[PDB]
Structure formats: structure tokens, C-alpha cells
Design a protein around this ligand. Structure first.
Ligand SMILES: OC[C@H]1O[C@H](O[C@H]2[C@H](O)[C@@H](O)[C@@H](O[C@H]3[C@H](O)[C@@H](O)[C@@H](O[C@H]4[C@H](O)[C@@H](O)[C@@H](O[C@@H]5[C@@H](O)[C@@H](O)O[C@H](CO)[C@H]5O)O[C@@H]4CO)O[C@@H]3CO)O[C@@H]2CO)[C@H](O)[C@@H](O)[C@@H]1O
Length: 554
């Protein structure tokens, strides 16, 4: 819908449909006008905020507005008219160079499990030193318990998180404290329950498919209209919620043979309105992130799993699944200096040459992390990294990524040493999709807890039980990162021995000692932070025997 004066126009794209009725609960049932492209319209003046509606089909069946701005009673319920309060700054205050990201899943972040709860932690976040929070998909999904990837109404803010007014409030309040909100949005597929679009027109592709559901149609017959639906969604989050930016989910699953790729156009929209886009890409292809004049889509930054895997594999000894491609110290140094470990070499996991070099792009085209919703949640037993390594090792990990040239991302809970798992959970009601997610989860991941069990979700709620030592260490890591100008700067000299490595920047050097070992230190510096009490205040060039631990010098 659109609010013009006293009156509101309803627009529904539905080429498969012969005629559609607008049905406003308590008001009437109105026949809509059809243009030759398959759009049905009607201008109404008896309509006010909070009115509810559905569309009734050829079928006589009723369905919610797929473009709904609010789904008060979940995915099968009526759509409802929201206040179009359309103030948005023309510019985000977030500077990409300065970005430190905090990943949040509203549902489990906080005893409340709502936006209100996240507002309550804003001081904490601000003080920690984070500059922007990334919110996992809030697009209306079935039930109350879901990561968000089963979202099925791209424009509706999940009822149970506190709806539109809550999300709006969360972003006004984070702006008030000087933090940005980044929104995780899903354009690659659509959840299995509560999707009605199939009945309306070719929203989805015959050609291609994703593991998680039906993919959008961007390049076959009738795709102008769907390109539009997605592009207007990024416009909408910006204007109607004043979001600062986006993390785009699984971009490698957004397939488009059009003359200009839909991803280049998404970036275009966000840049038109001066915002930030991060892509999750498994492609290891600089094309996602390269400028247009270099044939790229010009997305601002992309997740680099190779950094995370390097660290995790090495430190944990783990080799299941994608970890088989990793394990050596080498892999960490590689990712530390060429960004991608798979930059065009053979992957035994994938059984093909994977990736491409990234060139001279600086570090702030990439985001790195030792934890996140996937790298915890996709483990059968949801274990956080903190269960898989010792204490020294955990802090060494935090240092490796927060002191890296790349944009770092903390996974809610990581900073204070959360020990509770993060499981896959879902809340479908359809007994065939309940049966399907359980059997799927059991076999891709070896997940023994039931995703549809409420306890599984509860187990995943952050404890807020603070480990002051770990928390303090993060606080300083973040501070020192800013003071030392580490951000984006790829000019780092890295030496390694069997069980240690030293990384040296323009302003600093770090000691990463994985086992007691004897090291030649080529620099002089004074100590900024350390994982132990065993490193000197001031060190000089010379050879030293260190115990497992990390240290930072200037
Ligand atoms: O009817 C359609 C479809 O339904 C069924 O599929 C079910 C799956 O079996 C079940 O596992 C579940 O999938 C979950 C994933 O388990 C979970 O990992 C998550 O994944 C999202 C990530 O969180 C997100 O960050 C992103 O990450 C990556 C990709 O970038 C890339 O590297 O590939 C991996 C490998 O999977 C991803 O982790 O993208 C993910 C998806 O957006 O969320 C999904 C969705 O909830 O869910 C469905 C049903 O709930 C059925 O079995 C299937 O056969 C059928 O075709």
C-alpha cells in the first residue's frame, strides 16, 4: 500500500490471477482493477491505521498481503496498516573504516527476547566499544522461535520481537547512543511456511534452487516485477526504519544472468541513500566487492570464512566438513596477508579450484570473526568456540581477529565468555515441515536436540554470566585497535615458527604463542595488553622463551 492523502492505494502484483478482491476486515470486500502486466489496484478512503486486510483470489481463498508491512497474528494471519512515518537521515554517521560489529539474535539475546531487550543493552554495547549492531532477520517468520532465515514476509517486522514500533524504537535509541543498526536481509530464498506468492505469479525460478527453499526469479519471464519487489525492500528498510545498512544473506545463492546483476543494483540503492552493504559470500570472488570500473558489484565488504576457519581448524584440531580444507598455521598467515586462503587453489572439500586473489583492496572490504550464528549454530551440538579450546587459546583467537586489518564481528555473548550453546531452532506448525526440518537437521549437522523443541531455544538464550577477565580483555582489544589505527591497514609483516607467530603493523606488534617456545623478537615496544602476567612492560630486540599466551606492544 501507499498513503497519498486521506486515501490509500492498494497494489498487488498477481499475473496468475483473473480477479482479486480486497477484503478489509470489518469494512467490506472491494473488487480491484487489473492492468495488462498483472497488477491489481484500488484507491480507498475509508481506511485508517491499524485496519486489517487480506486479498481474496480467483480461488475464493484468502491470503495476506505478500508486501505486508505487519503481520499481527503471524504468517497465516491478516495483514495490518502501519504508520508510514517516513523520516530518515540522508546519511548514516557510521564510517566503514571504523566499523566494529555486534551480531544479535533478538529472540535469545536477552530474557525479554524483544527489541525492548536489546535497547536495554545499548549502554553495555556502547561501553564495550562496538560501533554497530547487526540484527538477524526480522522479516516475519512462522511462530516465535527461528534464526530468521525462514522469514516469509520481506516487509513485515516480526510480531513477536515487538513489531514495527519496537524496531523503529530500537533504531532511534541506538542512534541516540551513537550506535548503528545493520539489518540481515534475505533475498536468496523464502521460508517454507506461510508463503503465498506461488499462487500469484512467477516470483520464483524454474531454473535454479537453494537448499533452504524456493529462490527468487531475477532473469526469466516476468522478473521486472520481482527485481522491483526486492529493490524496493532495500529502499523501504532505509526510508521507513532509518536502518544504517545491510548484511545480505548467502549472495552466492542469488543467481542472475541479467546484463546488470541484481546485487549490483542492490548496492546501487543503498549507496543512492548513502548507506552500507555487507555481503555474505561463499564465492571467494573479489567481484562482489570490487568497484564497478573494476567489474564488480561494489558491495562495501563481504564475510571471509577463510579467516575464521583458519583459526578454528588450527586451534581446535577439528577437520569435519569444511575444516578439512584447513588446519595449518600457514593457513592463518595466508588469510592474514592475502585475505582468502582459497584464492584460486584446489579444495578437497569442494573438489574443484576455488576462489580468486583479492588484489590491492584494503582490509575494510572484509569482515572476520571467530564466532557467529552459523559457526556456532550449524554444529550439531551448538558448541561455542570457548568449549573447544583452552582459555589462553580463546584469548589468542579474540586477539587474532580484533587486531586484524579487517572489520571484526563479535557474536553476542562471546565478549564475556558465554558458555551456553546456540542451537538451530524453528517454530513451524505444519507437521510435514516439522518432520522435514528435524530429519534435515539430524543429517546435515548431526543435531540431536530437536529444533522444534522450546527447550532448544531456551538453552540458547544468553546467560549474561560475566567472566570479568575475558570481558575486560575484549574491552581493551577493541580500544587498542582504534588507538593503533589497525583498521583496514593490510601492510603487516608476519613471521611464524612451529608453534608461534608475530604480527607487526605500522604501530604495533603482537606475539601469538601457541606452545611454550623460544622466539627471536625483532622489535622494541611497550606492553599494551597481554593474556598473562608473564610478558614484560617493555621488551627489546632479542630472543625470549615464552609460555602459551598473547601480548601486544607499541
Ligand atoms: O521446502 C524447502 C526445503 O525445506 C527443507 O530444508 C530445511 C533444512 O533441512 C534445515 O537445515 C534448515 O536450514 C537452515 C540451516 O540449517 C541453517 O544453517 C540456516 O542457514 C542460513 C545461515 O544462517 C546464513 O547465515 C547463510 O549461511 C550459509 C551460506 O552462506 C553457505 O555457506 O551455505 C551454507 C550451507 O547450508 C549456509 O549456512 O544462509 C543460510 C540460509 O539462508 O538457515 C536455514 C533455514 O532456516 O531449514 C529448512 C526448513 O526449515 C527441506 O529439508 C529441503 O530439502 C527443501 O528443499
Amino acid at each position: 500500500y501507499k498513503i497519498d492523502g486521506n486515501e490509500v492505494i492498494f497494489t498487488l502484483w498477481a499475473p496468475y490471477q483473473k480477479s482479486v478482491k480486497l477484503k478489509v476486515l470489518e469494512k467490506g470486500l472491494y473488487e480491484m482493477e487489473r492492468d495488462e502486466k498483472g497488477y491489481f489496484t484500488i484507491t480507498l478512503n475509508n481506511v485508517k491505521v491499524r485496519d486489517r486486510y487480506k486479498y481474496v483470489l480467483d480461488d475464493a481463498s484468502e491470503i495476506p498481503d505478500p508486501a505486508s508491512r505487519y503481520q499481527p497474528e503471524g504468517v497465516h494471519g491478516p495483514s495490518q496498516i502501519i504508520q508510514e512515518s517516513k523520516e530518515f537521515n540522508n546519511e548514516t554517521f557510521l564510517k566503514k573504516e571504523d566499523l566494529i560489529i555486534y551480531e544479535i539474535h533478538v529472540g535469545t539475546f536477552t530474557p525479554e527476547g524483544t527489541f525492548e531487550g536489546v535497547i536495554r543493552k545499548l549502554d553495555y554495547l556502547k561501553d564495550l566499544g562496538i560501533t554497530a549492531i547487526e540484527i538477524m532477520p526480522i522479516a516475519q517468520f512462522p511462530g516465535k522461535r527461528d534464526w530468521g532465515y525462514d522469514g516469509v514476509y520481506l516487509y513485515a517486522v516480526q510480531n513477536s520481537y515487538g513489531g514495527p514500533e519496537g524496531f523503529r524504537k530500537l533504531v532511534d535509541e541506538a542512534h541516540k547512543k551513537g550506535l548503528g543498526v545493520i539489518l540481515d536481509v534475505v533475498y536468496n530464498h523464502v521460508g517454507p511456511e506461510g508463503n503465498y506468492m506461488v499462487k500469484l505469479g512467477p516470483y520464483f525460478s524454474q531454473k535454479y534452487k537453494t537448499p533452504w527453499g524456493l529462490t527468487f526469479n531475477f532473469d526469466d519471464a516476468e522478473s521486472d516485477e520481482v527485481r522491483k519487489f526486492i529493490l524496493e525492500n532495500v529502499e523501504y528498510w532505509i526510508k521507513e526504519y532509518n536502518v544504517d545498512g545491510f548484511r545480505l544473506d548467502a549472495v552466492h545463492a542469488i543467481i542472475d544472468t541479467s546484463p546488470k546483476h541484481i546485487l549490483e543494483e542492490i548496492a546501487d540503492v543503498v549507496h543512492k541513500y548513502n548507506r552500507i552493504v555487507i555481503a555474505q559470500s561463499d564465492l571467494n570472488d573479489p567481484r562482489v566487492v570490487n568497484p564497478k570500473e573494476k567489474c564488480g558489484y561494489n558491495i562495501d565488504a563481504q564475510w571471509v570464512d577463510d579467516f575464521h576457519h583458519s583459526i578454528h581448524a588450527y586451534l581446535t584440531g577439528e577437520r569435519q566438513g569444511y575444516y578439512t580444507d584447513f588446519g595449518n598455521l600457514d593457513d592463518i598467515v595466508k588469510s592474514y596477508k592475502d585475505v582468502f586462503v582459497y584464492d584460486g587453489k584446489y579444495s578437497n572439500f569442494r573438489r574443484k579450484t576455488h576462489g580468486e586473489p583479492v588484489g590491492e583492496l584494503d582490509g575494510c572490504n572484509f569482515v572476520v570473526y571467530i564466532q557467529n550464528h552459523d559457526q556456532v549454530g550449524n554444529r550439531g551440538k551448538g558448541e561455542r568456540i570457548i568449549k573447544l579450546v583452552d582459555r589462553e587459546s580463546y584469548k589468542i583467537a579474540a586477539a587474532l581477529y580484533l587486531l586484524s586489518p579487517y572489520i571484526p564481528m563479535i557474536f553476542m555473548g562471546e565478549e564475556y565468555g558465554e558458555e551456553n550453546p546456540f542451537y538451530f531452532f524453528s517454530d513451524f506448525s505444519d507437521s510435514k515441515l516439522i518432520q522435514g526440518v528435524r530429519e534435515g537437521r539430524k543429517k546435515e549437522n548431526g543435531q540431536d536436540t530437536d529444533p522444534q523443541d522450546e527447550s532448544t531455544f531456551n538453552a540458547s538464550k544468553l546467560s549474561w554470566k560475566i567472566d570479568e577477565e575475558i570481558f575486560s580483555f575484549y574491552k581493551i582489544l577493541i580500544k587498542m585497535r582504534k588507538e593503533l589505527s589497525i583498521a583496514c591497514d593490510r601492510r603487516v609483516n608476519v613471521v611464524n615458527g612451529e608453534n608461534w607467530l608475530i604480527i607487526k603493523g605500522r604501530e604495533y606488534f603482537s606475539l601469538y604463542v601457541f606452545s611454550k617456545s623460544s622466539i627471536e623478537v625483532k622489535y622494541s615496544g611497550t606492553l599494551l595488553l597481554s593474556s598473562n602476567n608473564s610478558f614484560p612492560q617493555h621488551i627489546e630486540e632479542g630472543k625470549y622463551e615464552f609460555d602459551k599466551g598473547f601480548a601486544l606492544y607499541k
